[PDB]
Design a protein around this ligand. Structure first.
Ligand SMILES: [Zn+2]
Ligand SMILES: [Zn+2]
Length: 70
């Protein structure tokens, strides 16, 4: 039948206005945020590493690192 609406997967809620998608799955414009700083990626630049999404900033902070004395 026609019993199936697109609802956020993060919190598992319905999406009426302001929504996005990720990996063939719905995501709220407030749920699709970073995994370290919880920043609304919806709109800005962002890239996932394995499963979660980490904004460039965090991405180049958690894993990335500088030299010894610097
Ligand atoms: Zn949500
Ligand atoms: Zn971040």
């Amino acid at each position: 039948g026609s019993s199936g609406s697109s609802g956020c997967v993060q919190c598992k809620k319905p999406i009426t206005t302001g929504g996005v998608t990720y990996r063939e799955q719905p995501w709220h414009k407030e749920c699709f945020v970073c995994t370290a700083c919880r920043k609304q990626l919806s709109g800005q630049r962002f890239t996932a590493r394995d499963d979660f999404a980490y904004c460039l900033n965090c991405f180049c902070d958690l894993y990335a690192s500088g030299p010894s004395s610097g």
